[PDB]
């Protein structure tokens, strides 16, 4: 009983550090997304001019 | 036997998906379920005879007078439409468990003698 | 002053249990730890009703724990009120029932009755003014039909003038999970009628209709069936507990409930339930609340409410709010369905006011029902007996272990004769 | 039927959008509140297992007000098939559910030995006199002295204890003497550094004792012996830990075993962050 | 706590037991050392595998099981094979001389040289056993240990043990192929003991497995090893409830109560579904109603009897995984409408259901694809009698002639019980008759 106490708090825990993952890998993505959109758009523009 | 039975040391056993499934089984909370509009728990502890003897009706919002409602009908304050949401009924019973329950004794050794017997003040002395 | 035992068994009744002392715990501000963190001084004026004082300000639950196989001891220890619960109440056995009832009420369930009835007895005595009992079990499985109808039996003839209520789960036709449970549930109910003055049947098919339908949920897993039925173990008693404009404890229920000795089957509701999206756009009034009350999908009793007539109705109200809106809505569903009420009983609604709401909630209402189409539940058990006791199928696990077959028998005649009741009535 | 998921607008979708929005928005408001039980154990952690920096010796005797570490030096054994190899460090241990509910530190808290060397804000120990403002003076024999652990805080000081045994007070799983820590003053934080020898043991009471040396740490009260149990585990938020009590322990010949011995441990000159190890 | 002694009987129970307790050492993460691996420090509150493995002081874990058998052609291979240093010594017993598919050799003659031996290692296995569930038995009808060594060993089980369960998996003769010549001699002698002395006999041959990693895992040239694994993955699903947690948890004597309706009917079905390639996993959509619709299929049953002939009588569905209870009810309730599934007028509610939340585990490089919900249903159908009708079909036409009868006669055993053990299953293919009639 003791130790299934222990296992239940530790996988708590692990419930927070996995939706903390959840919602910083979706920032990452956007700001990865947005920096290779921007650069494709300015190497466009100056190889036209 | 000996071609198809090998050791696999590859740390095989995976502890995560039964848990998972314990919290999926357990559900949604109180919050969740039944608690409606994001009440806090603090505002609804109030009594009638509390709200109307002893704060002898006291709502600082409510204006003294009524006044016709207009587009409905009849007059729009209403006392026990709009109760007091004030901090709650309180009196000296939780300081006295307090006081009575977390008090240690920090004196272990005590004669009846000696704790019954004290030097009396003179202020008391006749 | 006036304390409620509480009385679980079996792995049904161990779990409505937990999740019955989490609500109540939230109720009286307790922390999982034991001590008290609240506010109001309410909340400690009556609190021995259900929490025995210890040293230090640590306040645990009168409750006893039985079962005779330890794999819901575990999980009851190791949830998220698990300390709260004294180590010395929880009585567990060897060897599961096996879904018998043989097991649970002669054989491995009768040296275990030794056991609780020294706990029940140690803790009867500890209180100042004992209310009553309560207890809640599971009739389809066989240690909760078996010992806990054993257990009701014993304390009857212990503590003859006393108040005694059941919250007992029924089996259901469609969601049956046990093959031999017409068996198990013949048998309890046979033992229930005789030590019994309220009997609250909850099925579990009336259950995920609530959810699916009231609720709109997705996966309605145990964790909600066990926590709607913990609203209604709470709002029942909750003007013993908390001061009120008309209080209305547990015997008053069963003085206005409960017209002839073996009519004590109610159907239990649960009034103000929405789902997430209906939530902040209804508004909590008097009347929604009424108008949610008498619904037939609204009860926690697998039966029809339109097919039979209301006996007796009471309703219990909690929160700061009127009183003319309560008797102008219950004498307005009573002058409109005159037909769905009985003629030779005036007045059949019961009116009771609390003050403090259940936390979260604005106003709530509970609702208890004895009606005549309780009748229902019993002959979708009966007609399975019959039907399979005629060709004496799984009746070697009965017989084998200390049981003549003329239990089986009377279990027939009481059962039938009890429907025979409700059927004069209606 | 067929199910898909969160995204795609099929099916009671709306419902679902509902629950996980104010499920997100609940945990969004507890993470900024900060009640987040691995922001808790992140702070718990960040005090316990912070670095720490010992004292360092000129002529090999351990003075007062030095930082010290205890270590139990490793020994073949046979008593067990299982058992803890290498030296251990004496640690304090907090209680693992109380710690993980509140935040608070719960007096009083155990003991254990770990498998470290490099000392954290989990292990220092101060030597101190139980007479006070002692300045240029040298541990001896045979005299007593108290232990003192700040654990990692700036707060408290904690020391060692432990009373006679009673039917109600045992260690946790090897039912002998316990050793815990207090913040009360008495005579039970009291200890005694003794000669493992039993010959030459009244001969060398009353000179200064070594450091980095194999000694006895005897009780005054109750004349127990600080011992490590390397055969019995201690689950703990920290790992597998052995376990630490206070008893004498005697072979045949009436000799203290490997169990009882102890060595204070202090800092390396070269590096101050490493042990003499 | 709860605790089982396996007992694996002849050259199929030892190659199933190779298989089986593989299993079990790849569940609990147990190596072939007999030590779990060290990288557990987080890891804790584990002790479900006490049901099987014995701790020991040096941490060492040894599986509660016995290995029978009267030639040291089989286990020797297990002596010096990966699993040397994991089981006894002394828990792998070997004979001499084998049976050679003869009855009476393997009840009379040689079988009751070791039969002292045998016991006396139970009996050093039952007094640590704080609490026994019962007993679990692997043989083959056609054998001469199987069916001569199991005929005797039952009833020497029940005179020292009263009334705990017994619970068979036993290899059924197969209706078209098999291996040996007088198979029906065996199968007809010990199935006449067994019937007083045991309490539930799960059922399984050799063809339906032929056929279902054909056109399932699409192997098309499969051995024994392949096989086993499949009968390997029934018993932990009939099992896992008393190792692992769950909703509903089912005992031993749980899923003994809801499947036999008389004292002489104890015969299941086994079925496993699903059971799937590796590839064709990773697009098939596996809800909780096709993973029960394929149960009732007479193409996945895994003996080659089709239920539609006959009735149900009970069954018994066992979950693992990610179940919900309430596809649960959803899914039956489907069935619950179908007019091709039949069921007897005197069972009004049949199903017994129970959840395990430990999904299944597959051993690494293995046929069959890891899934995380699985169902293992052991169904009682009528439809068994037809086995019975072409077996004793096969008896009569060659007991006529007398043919080898002197291998049986010259031995030790009677002529007079060959029509005895005739004469009682006529009698008892009455009694599935009677059972079938309709009120
Ligand atoms: N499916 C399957 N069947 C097996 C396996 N091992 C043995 N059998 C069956 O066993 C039958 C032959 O009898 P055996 O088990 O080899 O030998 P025995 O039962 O010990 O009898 P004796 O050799 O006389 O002692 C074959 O018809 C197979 O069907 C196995 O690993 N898998
Ligand atoms: N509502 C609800 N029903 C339950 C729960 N646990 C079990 N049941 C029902 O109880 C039946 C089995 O009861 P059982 O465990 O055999 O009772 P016992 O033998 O006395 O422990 C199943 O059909 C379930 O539907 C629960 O936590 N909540
Ligand atoms: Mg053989």
Same mark, same amino acid.
């Given at each position: 009983v003791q130790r299934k106490q222990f296992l239940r708090l530790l996988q708590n825990e692990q419930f927070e550090l996995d939706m903390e993952e959840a919602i910083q890998k979706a920032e990452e993505n956007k700001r990865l997304k947005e920096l290779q959109l921007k650069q494709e758009e300015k190497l466009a523009m100056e190889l036209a001019k | 036997y000996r071609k198809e039975y090998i050791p696999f040391p590859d740390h095989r056993p995976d502890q995560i998906s039964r848990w998972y499934g314990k919290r999926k089984v357990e559900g949604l909370p109180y919050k969740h379920l039944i608690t409606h509009h994001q009440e806090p728990p603090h505002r609804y502890l109030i009594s009638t005879y509390?709200?109307?003897?002893?704060?002898?009706?006291?709502?600082?919002?409510?204006?003294?007078?009524?006044?016709?409602?207009?587009?409905?009908?009849?007059?729009?304050?209403?006392?026990?439409?709009?109760?007091?949401?004030?901090?709650?009924?309180?009196?000296?019973?939780?300081?006295?468990?307090?006081?009575?329950?977390?008090?240690?004794?920090?004196?272990?050794?005590?004669?009846?003698y000696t704790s019954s017997y004290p030097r009396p003040p003179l202020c008391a002395m006749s | 002053m006036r304390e409620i035992v509480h009385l679980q068994a079996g792995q049904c009744g161990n779990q409505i249990g937990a999740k019955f002392w989490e609500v109540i715990s939230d109720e009286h501000g307790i922390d999982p730890t034991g001590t008290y963190h609240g506010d109001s001084d309410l909340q400690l004026e009556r609190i021995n009703v259900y929490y025995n004082e210890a040293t230090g300000g640590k306040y645990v639950p009168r409750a006893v724990l039985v079962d005779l196989e330890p794999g819901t001891m575990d999980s009851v220890r190791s949830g998220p009120f698990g300390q709260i619960f004294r180590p010395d109440n929880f009585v567990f056995g060897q060897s599961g029932a096996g879904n018998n009832w043989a097991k649970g009420h002669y054989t491995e369930g009768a040296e275990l009755v030794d056991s609780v009835l020294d706990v029940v007895r140690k803790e009867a005595e500890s209180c100042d003014c004992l209310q009553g009992f309560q207890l809640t079990h599971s009739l389809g499985g066989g240690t909760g039909s078996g010992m806990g109808t054993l257990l009701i039996s014993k304390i009857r003839e212990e503590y003859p003038d006393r108040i005694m209520n059941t919250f007992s789960v029924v089996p259901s036709p469609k969601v049956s999970d046990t093959?031999?449970?017409?068996?198990?549930?013949?048998?309890?109910?046979?033992?229930?009628?005789?030590?019994?003055?309220?009997?609250?049947?909850?099925?579990?098919?009336?259950?995920?209709?609530?959810?699916?339908?009231?609720?709109?949920l997705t996966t309605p897993t145990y964790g909600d069936l066990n926590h709607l039925v913990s609203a209604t173990m709470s709002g029942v008693t909750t003007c013993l507990r908390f001061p009120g404009q008309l209080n209305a404890d547990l015997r008053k229920l069963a003085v206005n409930m409960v017209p002839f000795p073996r009519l004590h089957?109610?159907?239990?509701?649960?009034?103000?339930?929405?789902?997430?999206?209906?939530?902040?756009?209804?508004?909590?009034?008097?009347?929604?609340?009424?108008?949610?009350?008498?619904?037939?999908?609204?009860?926690?009793?697998?039966?029809?409410?339109?097919?039979?007539?209301?006996?007796?109705?009471?309703?219990?109200?909690?929160?700061?709010?009127?009183?003319?809106?309560?008797?102008?809505?219950?004498?307005?569903?009573?002058?409109?369905?005159?037909?769905?009420?009985?003629?030779?009983?005036?007045?059949?609604?019961?009116?009771?006011?609390?003050?403090?709401?259940?936390?979260?909630?604005?106003?709530?209402?509970?609702?208890?029902?004895?009606?005549?189409?309780?009748?229902?539940?019993?002959?979708?058990?009966?007609?399975?007996?019959?039907?399979?006791?005629?060709?004496?199928?799984?009746?070697?696990?009965?017989?084998?272990?200390?049981?003549?077959?003329?239990?089986?028998?009377?279990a027939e005649s009481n059962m039938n004769d009890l429907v025979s009741e409700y059927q004069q009535y209606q | 039927q067929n199910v898909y998921g969160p995204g795609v607008r099929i099916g009671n979708w709306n419902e679902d959008v509902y629950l996980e929005e104010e499920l997100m928005k609940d945990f969004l408001e507890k993470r900024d509140k900060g009640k987040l039980l691995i922001?808790?154990?992140?702070?718990?952690?960040?005090?316990?297992?912070?670095?720490?920096?010992?004292?360092?010796?000129?002529?090999?005797?351990?003075?007062?007000?030095?930082?010290?570490?205890?270590?139990?030096?490793?020994?073949?054994?046979?008593?067990?098939?299982?058992?803890?190899?290498?030296?251990?460090?004496?640690?304090?241990?907090?209680?693992?559910?109380?710690?993980?509910?509140?935040?608070?530190?719960?007096?009083?808290?155990?003991?254990?030995?770990?498998?470290?060397?490099?000392?954290?804000?989990?292990?220092?120990?101060?030597?101190?006199?139980?007479?006070?403002?002692?300045?240029?003076?040298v541990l001896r024999y045979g005299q007593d002295f108290?232990?003192?652990?700040?654990?990692?805080?700036?707060?408290?000081?904690?020391?060692?204890?432990?009373? @006679? $045994?009673? &039917?109600?007070? +045992?260690?946790?799983?090897?039912?002998?003497? =316990? #050793?815990?820590?207090?913040?009360?003053?008495?005579?039970?934080?009291?200890?005694?550094?003794?000669?493992?020898?039993?010959?030459?043991?009244?001969?060398?009471?009353?000179?200064?004792?070594?450091?980095?040396?194999?000694?006895?740490?005897?009780?005054?009260?109750?004349?127990?012996?600080?011992?490590? @149990? $390397?055969? &019995?585990?201690? +689950?703990?938020?920290?790992?597998?830990?052995? =376990? #630490?009590?206070?008893?004498?322990?005697?072979?045949?010949?009436?000799?203290?075993?490997?169990?009882?011995?102890?060595?204070?441990?202090?800092?390396?000159?070269?590096?101050?962050?490493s042990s003499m190890l | 706590m709860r605790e089982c002694i396996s007992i694996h009987v002849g050259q199929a129970g030892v190659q199933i037991g190779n298989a089986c307790w593989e299993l079990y050492c790849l569940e609990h993460g147990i190596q072939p050392d007999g030590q779990?691996?060290?990288?557990?420090?987080?890891?804790?509150?584990?002790?479900?595998?006490?049901?099987?493995?014995?701790?020991?002081?040096?941490?060492?874990?040894?599986?509660?099981?016995?290995?029978?058998?009267?030639?040291?052609?089989?286990?020797?291979?297990?002596?010096?094979?990966?699993?040397?240093?994991?089981?006894?010594?002394?828990?792998?017993?070997?004979?001499?001389?084998?049976?050679?598919?003869?009855?009476?050799?393997?009840?009379?003659?040689?079988?009751?040289?070791?039969?002292?031996?045998?016991?006396?290692?139970?009996?050093?296995?039952?007094?640590?056993?704080?609490?026994?569930?019962?007993?679990?038995?692997?043989?083959?009808?056609?054998?001469?240990?199987?069916?001569?060594?199991?005929?005797?060993?039952?009833?020497?089980?029940?005179?020292?043990?009263?009334?705990?369960?017994?619970?068979?998996?036993?290899?059924?003769?197969?209706?078209?192929?098999?291996?040996?010549?007088?198979?029906?001699?065996?199968?007809?002698?010990?199935?006449?003991?067994?019937?007083?002395?045991?309490?539930?006999?799960?059922?399984?041959?050799?063809?339906?497995?032929?056929?279902?990693?054909?056109?399932?895992?699409?192997?098309?040239?499969?051995?024994?090893?392949?096989?086993?694994?499949?009968?390997?993955?029934?018993?932990?699903?009939?099992?896992?409830?008393?190792?692992?947690?769950?909703?509903?948890?089912?005992?031993?004597?749980?899923?003994?109560?809801?499947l036999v309706p008389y004292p002489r009917i104890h015969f299941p079905l086994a079925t496993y579904a699903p059971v799937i390639s590796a590839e064709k996993a990773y697009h098939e959509q596996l809800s909780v109603a096709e993973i029960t619709n394929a149960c009732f299929e007479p193409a996945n049953q895994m003996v080659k009897c089709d239920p539609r002939h006959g009735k149900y009588m009970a069954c018994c569905l066992?979950?693992?995984?990610?179940?919900?209870?309430?596809?649960?009810?959803?899914?039956?309730?489907?069935?619950?409408?179908?007019?091709?599934?039949?069921?007897?007028?005197?069972?009004?509610?049949?199903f017994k259901v129970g959840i395990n939340y430990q999904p299944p585990t597959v051993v690494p490089g293995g046929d069959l694809a890891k899934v995380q919900r699985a169902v293992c249903m052991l169904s009682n159908t009528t439809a068994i009698a037809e086995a019975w009708a072409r077996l004793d079909h096969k008896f009569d036409l060659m007991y006529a002639k007398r043919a080898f009868v002197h291998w049986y006669v010259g031995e030790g055993m009677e002529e007079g019980e060959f029509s005895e053990a005739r004469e009682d299953m006529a009698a008892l293919e009455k009694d599935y008759e009677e059972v079938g009639v309709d009120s």
């Amino acid at each position: 009983v003791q130790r299934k106490q222990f296992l239940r708090l530790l996988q708590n825990e692990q419930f927070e550090l996995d939706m903390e993952e959840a919602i910083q890998k979706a920032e990452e993505n956007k700001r990865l997304k947005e920096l290779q959109l921007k650069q494709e758009e300015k190497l466009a523009m100056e190889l036209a001019k | 036997y000996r071609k198809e039975y090998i050791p696999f040391p590859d740390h095989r056993p995976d502890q995560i998906s039964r848990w998972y499934g314990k919290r999926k089984v357990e559900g949604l909370p109180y919050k969740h379920l039944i608690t409606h509009h994001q009440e806090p728990p603090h505002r609804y502890l109030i009594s009638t005879y509390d709200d109307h003897y002893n704060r002898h009706g006291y709502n600082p919002g409510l204006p003294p007078l009524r006044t016709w409602n207009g587009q409905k009908l009849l007059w729009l304050p209403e006392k026990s439409d709009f109760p007091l949401l004030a901090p709650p009924t309180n009196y000296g019973l939780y300081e006295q468990l307090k006081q009575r329950q977390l008090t240690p004794k920090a004196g272990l050794k005590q004669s009846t003698y000696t704790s019954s017997y004290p030097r009396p003040p003179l202020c008391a002395m006749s | 002053m006036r304390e409620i035992v509480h009385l679980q068994a079996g792995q049904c009744g161990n779990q409505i249990g937990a999740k019955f002392w989490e609500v109540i715990s939230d109720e009286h501000g307790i922390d999982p730890t034991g001590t008290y963190h609240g506010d109001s001084d309410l909340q400690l004026e009556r609190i021995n009703v259900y929490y025995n004082e210890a040293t230090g300000g640590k306040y645990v639950p009168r409750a006893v724990l039985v079962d005779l196989e330890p794999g819901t001891m575990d999980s009851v220890r190791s949830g998220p009120f698990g300390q709260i619960f004294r180590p010395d109440n929880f009585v567990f056995g060897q060897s599961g029932a096996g879904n018998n009832w043989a097991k649970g009420h002669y054989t491995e369930g009768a040296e275990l009755v030794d056991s609780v009835l020294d706990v029940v007895r140690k803790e009867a005595e500890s209180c100042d003014c004992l209310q009553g009992f309560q207890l809640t079990h599971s009739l389809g499985g066989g240690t909760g039909s078996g010992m806990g109808t054993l257990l009701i039996s014993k304390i009857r003839e212990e503590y003859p003038d006393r108040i005694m209520n059941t919250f007992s789960v029924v089996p259901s036709p469609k969601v049956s999970d046990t093959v031999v449970e017409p068996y198990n549930a013949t048998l309890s109910v046979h033992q229930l009628v005789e030590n019994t003055d309220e009997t609250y049947c909850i099925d579990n098919e009336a259950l995920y209709d609530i959810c699916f339908r009231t609720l709109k949920l997705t996966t309605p897993t145990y964790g909600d069936l066990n926590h709607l039925v913990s609203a209604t173990m709470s709002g029942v008693t909750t003007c013993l507990r908390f001061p009120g404009q008309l209080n209305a404890d547990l015997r008053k229920l069963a003085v206005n409930m409960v017209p002839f000795p073996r009519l004590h089957f109610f159907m239990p509701g649960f009034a103000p339930l929405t789902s997430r999206g209906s939530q902040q756009y209804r508004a909590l009034t008097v009347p929604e609340l009424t108008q949610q009350m008498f619904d037939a999908k609204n009860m926690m009793a697998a039966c029809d409410p339109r097919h039979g007539r209301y006996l007796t109705v009471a309703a219990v109200f909690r929160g700061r709010m009127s009183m003319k809106e309560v008797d102008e809505q219950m004498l307005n569903v009573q002058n409109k369905n005159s037909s769905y009420f009985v003629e030779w009983i005036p007045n059949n609604v019961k009116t009771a006011v609390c003050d403090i709401p259940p936390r979260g909630l604005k106003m709530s209402a509970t609702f208890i029902g004895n009606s005549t189409a309780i009748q229902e539940l019993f002959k979708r058990i009966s007609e399975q007996f019959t039907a399979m006791f005629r060709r004496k199928a799984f009746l070697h696990w009965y017989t084998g272990e200390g049981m003549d077959e003329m239990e089986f028998t009377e279990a027939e005649s009481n059962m039938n004769d009890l429907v025979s009741e409700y059927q004069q009535y209606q | 039927q067929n199910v898909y998921g969160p995204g795609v607008r099929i099916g009671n979708w709306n419902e679902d959008v509902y629950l996980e929005e104010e499920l997100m928005k609940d945990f969004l408001e507890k993470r900024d509140k900060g009640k987040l039980l691995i922001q808790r154990s992140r702070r718990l952690k960040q005090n316990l297992l912070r670095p720490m920096q010992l004292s360092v010796t000129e002529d090999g005797y351990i003075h007062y007000g030095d930082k010290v570490m205890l270590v139990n030096p490793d020994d073949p054994d046979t008593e067990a098939d299982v058992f803890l190899r290498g030296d251990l460090s004496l640690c304090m241990t907090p209680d693992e559910i109380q710690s993980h509910l509140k935040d608070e530190l719960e007096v009083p808290c155990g003991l254990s030995a770990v498998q470290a060397k490099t000392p954290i804000g989990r292990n220092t120990f101060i030597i101190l006199s139980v007479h006070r403002d002692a300045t240029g003076q040298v541990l001896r024999y045979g005299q007593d002295f108290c232990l003192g652990i700040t654990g990692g805080f700036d707060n408290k000081m904690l020391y060692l204890s432990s009373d @006679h $045994r009673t &039917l109600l007070k +045992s260690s946790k799983r090897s039912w002998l003497q =316990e #050793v815990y820590l207090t913040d009360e003053v008495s005579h039970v934080n009291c200890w005694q550094a003794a000669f493992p020898d039993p010959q030459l043991r009244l001969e060398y009471e009353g000179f200064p004792v070594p450091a980095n040396a194999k000694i006895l740490i005897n009780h005054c009260h109750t004349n127990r012996g600080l011992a490590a @149990h $390397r055969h &019995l585990f201690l +689950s703990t938020y920290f790992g597998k830990e052995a =376990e #630490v009590v206070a008893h004498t322990y005697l072979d045949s010949h009436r000799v203290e075993k490997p169990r009882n011995h102890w060595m204070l441990v202090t800092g390396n000159p070269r590096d101050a962050s490493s042990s003499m190890l | 706590m709860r605790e089982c002694i396996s007992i694996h009987v002849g050259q199929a129970g030892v190659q199933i037991g190779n298989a089986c307790w593989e299993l079990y050492c790849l569940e609990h993460g147990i190596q072939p050392d007999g030590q779990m691996p060290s990288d557990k420090t987080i890891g804790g509150g584990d002790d479900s595998f006490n049901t099987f493995f014995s701790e020991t002081g040096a941490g060492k874990h040894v599986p509660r099981a016995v290995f029978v058998d009267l030639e040291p052609t089989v286990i020797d291979e297990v002596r010096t094979g990966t699993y040397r240093q994991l089981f006894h010594p002394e828990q792998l017993i070997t004979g001499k001389e084998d049976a050679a598919n003869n009855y009476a050799r393997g009840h009379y003659t040689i079988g009751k040289e070791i039969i002292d031996l045998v016991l006396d290692r139970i009996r050093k296995l039952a007094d640590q056993c704080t609490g026994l569930q019962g007993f679990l038995v692997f043989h083959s009808f056609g054998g001469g240990t199987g069916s001569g060594f199991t005929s005797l060993l039952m009833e020497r089980l029940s005179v020292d043990y009263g009334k705990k369960s017994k619970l068979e998996f036993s290899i059924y003769p197969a209706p078209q192929v098999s291996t040996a010549v007088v198979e029906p001699y065996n199968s007809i002698l010990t199935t006449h003991t067994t019937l007083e002395h045991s309490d539930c006999a799960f059922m399984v041959d050799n063809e339906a497995i032929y056929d279902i990693c054909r056109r399932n895992l699409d192997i098309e040239r499969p051995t024994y090893t392949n096989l086993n694994r499949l009968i390997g993955q029934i018993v932990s699903s009939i099992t896992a409830s008393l190792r692992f947690d769950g909703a509903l948890n089912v005992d031993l004597t749980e899923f003994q109560t809801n499947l036999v309706p008389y004292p002489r009917i104890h015969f299941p079905l086994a079925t496993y579904a699903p059971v799937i390639s590796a590839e064709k996993a990773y697009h098939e959509q596996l809800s909780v109603a096709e993973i029960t619709n394929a149960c009732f299929e007479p193409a996945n049953q895994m003996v080659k009897c089709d239920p539609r002939h006959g009735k149900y009588m009970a069954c018994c569905l066992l979950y693992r995984g990610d179940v919900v209870p309430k596809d649960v009810n959803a899914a039956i309730a489907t069935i619950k409408t179908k007019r091709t599934i039949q069921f007897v007028d005197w069972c009004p509610t049949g199903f017994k259901v129970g959840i395990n939340y430990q999904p299944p585990t597959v051993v690494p490089g293995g046929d069959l694809a890891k899934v995380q919900r699985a169902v293992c249903m052991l169904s009682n159908t009528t439809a068994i009698a037809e086995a019975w009708a072409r077996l004793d079909h096969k008896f009569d036409l060659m007991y006529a002639k007398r043919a080898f009868v002197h291998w049986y006669v010259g031995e030790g055993m009677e002529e007079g019980e060959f029509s005895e053990a005739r004469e009682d299953m006529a009698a008892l293919e009455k009694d599935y008759e009677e059972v079938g009639v309709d009120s």
